[PDB]
């Protein structure tokens, strides 16, 4: 099995238009949640969202190129280019067939579908854009990243709702472990702030209807009432260890475990007691070849829904036993909102940086303790601590449980 | 870990029949599944033909109340997955549920549901959007509903890679079992792309054939080919670790031995010059199988009936196989089924597996005018009875997604 290390990071999030800004805001407990501006909030019971601020795609590419990309693809291309530049990786003709791309999205180009369907209704099918299909489909983030980078290796796109970013990174990790690529540009992207996405997640009451941006996203709080929707992309460069060392790459950490399970229960409701999530964490722990007590910090899925936070806490207790009260847990969705398909990507970046910088980001907004959510959620303030192992969960709608384990890099 | 992986069950819905036996017997008899479009009114579109399911009434498989909560792409996936598990005679007992996973992809997911729910949003407002809209529309719902129906609690995912979807999904499921992470995987592809926006979109970028004659519309490798004919359905197989299949007395159709994945990194929709990416995917699959190229007896081509796919796929076969390119047999079953998009790789994996099990190569129908650039042996018009040892199946998808599988006769 090959060892796989993290050599580059790239991100766009409601906390900043690069990794450094996003991470610095996360470690200082800054909220990225504000009033909805992308759509007319009057039409929905949800009133807040976590949007990108001050993002001008034309700062990264020509207007003609950006006009042929839905926002989810624009975020993926920008974050992937940022990650490859951070990695100082030169994708030459010689290495191109060994550099792959595995970036997922939960929804793909929903904004493009909506605008093009309105054109179909008013102008007819003969006025639908020739670019409609490639712009909408979720695999276009990987497709456009591959063209932008000249990456000709293993190529895919995972679509698993909230688990998308975590599954994509895990799948890319497995490609490198088995020797099928030397480098993988991987993660998740999402631009879900659209009319249908707000209508859909309001119709099934998943979104918080709390109009106060100061308290809307409050994972583990007794008064939590649903998630706050966010947007962005989190992309990392995974690389085979010997390949990284030979080119003098900087190494942030090592990816060592990946677990994937299904609840086989319900289309949207998480399984009772978090049994599926517990099994995914146990599979990742076994994959890493460690004891559960070796985990220092869990970057929780922690979406601020009643059932997720309760069941994820139960799953942590099942897996860790007495150690559940010794490790630190935090939900960075308290600050970023739920980035859906990009959540696992941004959270893998925060998990990797927590190890590299020795800082645990906090869960903000816990004002009322919930007796069912009684672990150490690192409330309010970041904690400076040397970390050896970090576990990140994505317990997605539809029963998709995905877990990654990261380790401090040791020669 | 390198476990052997065998095929123990097949399930399908295609324009050639509502089960595997009917679809297979029609394919080996050169029966065309193409006719006039009935799903949408084709008067306003330039494409006039399609390959639809015949006499498929979902109420024959489930209650109307259950069907109403599933988009057609999920109905096809659940029906084909249940037929595959019944064919495999697999009882997912308690100790086996966490070792049985699902990896089924779709290129578009619930596009019909998205169009109808957005039209409701526009005309009636967001309160009329169904609470089931989001789960019904997302492509990962095929895996999600199959997992619930079967009680499969193991590794689960959904790949979305346009035309390569079904082939990537099976390859990825094969890798899960090969590395020891599941004992059984229910995998393949599903698609219900006969919708207003899909026809409008593939007409707008001229990918579809505008040929109104169903007798000649899909004619892969013919000099007069002019685009693909859209189809629908699902192709699902049961992959199983060998020792497990033997312990439960499973019937074995064949073995999956190689999988290759590459990216063209060229253009959003246009295939790379001379099929270079496709050649690299075939070479990666051959290398993965540990065989010489001369060991391939039959190639189930991607062969979509577009000018550039068929020309470049022929060039890629010559690059990989050299003189052996004129010795092996090649055929495109899309000459009969049309292009099933995300389900193409699933149905084509079933036809590749059955070609080995039954020792019959299905033909390419409708070649009336030889093309000097497409001069390989396309098994024209009539099926060929032949003992096969290795079969290669390609999916060279829009967006530069190249995927190849290699199947082997099981002793
Ligand atoms: Cl055409
Ligand atoms: K709510
Ligand atoms: K997480
Ligand atoms: K094929």
UniProtKB/Swiss-Prot annotation, chain A:
Q: Which domain of life is it from?
A: Bacteria
Q: Which CDD domains match?
A: KAS_I_II
Disulfide bond entries: none
Chemical reaction(s) catalysed: a fatty acyl-[ACP] + malonyl-[ACP] + H(+) = a 3-oxoacyl-[ACP] + holo-[ACP] + CO2; (9Z)-hexadecenoyl-[ACP] + malonyl-[ACP] + H(+) = 3-oxo-(11Z)-octadecenoyl-[ACP] + holo-[ACP] + CO2
**Which Pfam families does the record associate with it?**
ketoacyl-synt, Ketoacyl-synt_C
Please list every transmembrane segment annotated in the UniProt record, as residue ranges. none
Q: Which UniProt keywords apply?
A: Acyltransferase, Fatty acid biosynthesis, Fatty acid metabolism, Lipid biosynthesis, Lipid metabolism, Transferase
Listed GO MF terms: 3-oxoacyl-[acyl-carrier-protein] synthase activity
Ranges for domain Ketosynthase family 3 (KS3) come to 1-408
Q: Does the keyword Endoplasmic reticulum apply?
A: no
Key word Phosphoprotein present: no
Q: How is its activity regulated?
A: Inhibited by cerulenin.
Residues annotated as the enzyme's active site: 162, 301, 338
Q: InterPro entries recorded for this chain? A: 3-oxoacyl-ACP_synth-2, Beta-ketoacyl_synthase, Ketoacyl_synth_AS, Ketoacyl_synth_C, Ketoacyl_synth_N, PKS_Beta-ketoAc_synthase_dom, Thiolase-like
Query: What PROSITE patterns does the entry give?
Result: KS3_1 (PS00606), KS3_2 (PS52004)
User: Which EC number applies?
Assistant: 2.3.1.179
Q: Which Gene3D superfamilies match?
A: 3.40.47.10
Q: What class of enzyme is it?
A: transferase
Tell me the route in metabolism or biology where this protein functions: Lipid metabolism; fatty acid biosynthesis
**A cellular component term, taken from the record's GO annotations:** cytosol
A GO biological process held by the record: fatty acid biosynthetic process
User: What's this protein's family per the entry?
Assistant: Belongs to the thiolase-like superfamily. Beta-ketoacyl-ACP synthases family.
NCBIfam families, alphabetically? fabF, PRK06333.1, PRK07314.1
The record's function comment reads: Involved in the type II fatty acid elongation cycle. Catalyzes the elongation of a wide range of acyl-ACP by the addition of two carbons from malonyl-ACP to an acyl acceptor. Can efficiently catalyze the conversion of palmitoleoyl-ACP (cis-hexadec-9-enoyl-ACP) to cis-vaccenoyl-ACP (cis-octadec-11-enoyl-ACP), an essential step in the thermal regulation of fatty acid composition.
Q: What is this protein called?
A: 3-oxoacyl-[acyl-carrier-protein] synthase 2
The lineage is: Bacteria, Bacillati, Bacillota, Bacilli, Bacillales
């Amino acid at each position: 099995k090959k060892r796989v290390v993290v050599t580059g990071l790239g991100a766009l999030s409601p906390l900043g238009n690069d990794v450094d800004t996003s991470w610095n805001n996360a470690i200082n407990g800054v909220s990225g949640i504000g009033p909805i501006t992308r759509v007319d909030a009057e039409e929905y019971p949800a009133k807040v969202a976590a949007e990108l601020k001050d993002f001008n795609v034309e700062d990264y590419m020509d207007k003609k190129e950006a006009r042929k990309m839905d926002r989810f693809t624009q975020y993926a291309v920008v974050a992937a280019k940022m990650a490859v530049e951070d990695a100082d990786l030169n994708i030459t003709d010689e290495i191109a067939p060994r550099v792959g791309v595995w970036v997922g999205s939960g929804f793909g180009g929903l904004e493009t579908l909506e605008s093009q369907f309105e054109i179909f209704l008013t102008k007819g099918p003969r006025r639908v854009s020739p670019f409609f299909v490639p712009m909408m489909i979720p695999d276009m983030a990987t497709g456009q990243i591959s063209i932008a980078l000249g990456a000709k290796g293993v190529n895919s796109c995972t679509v698993t709702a909230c688990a998308t970013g975590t599954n994509s990174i895990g799948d890319a990790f497995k490609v490198i472990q088995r020797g099928d690529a030397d480098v993988m540009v991987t993660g998740g992207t999402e631009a879900p702030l659209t009319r249908m996405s707000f209508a859909g997640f309001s119709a099934n009451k998943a979104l918080s209807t709390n109009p106060d941006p100061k308290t809307a996203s409050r994972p583990f709080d007794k008064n939590r009432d649903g998630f706050v929707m966010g947007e962005g992309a989190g992309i990392i460069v995974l690389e085979e260890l010997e390949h990284a060392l030979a080119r003098g790459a900087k190494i942030y950490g090592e990816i060592v475990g990946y677990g994937s399970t299904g609840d086989a229960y319900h289309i949207t409701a998480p399984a009772q007691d978090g049994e599926g999530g517990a099994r995914a964490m146990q599979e990742a722990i076994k994959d890493a070849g460690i004891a559960p007590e070796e985990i220092d910090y869990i970057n929780a899925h922690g979406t601020s829904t009643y059932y997720n936070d309760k069941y994820e806490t139960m799953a942590i207790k099942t897996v860790f036993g007495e150690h559940a009260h010794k490790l630190a847990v935090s939900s960075t969705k308290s600050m970023t909102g739920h980035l859906l398909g990009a959540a696992g990507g941004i959270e893998a970046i925060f998990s990797i940086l927590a190890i590299k910088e020795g800082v645990i980001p906090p869960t903000i907004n816990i004002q009322t303790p919930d007796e069912e959510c009684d672990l150490d959620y690192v409330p309010d303030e970041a904690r400076r601590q040397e970390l050896n192992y970090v576990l990140s969960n994505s317990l997605g709608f539809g029963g998709h449980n995905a877990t990654l384990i990261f380790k401090k890099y040791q020669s």
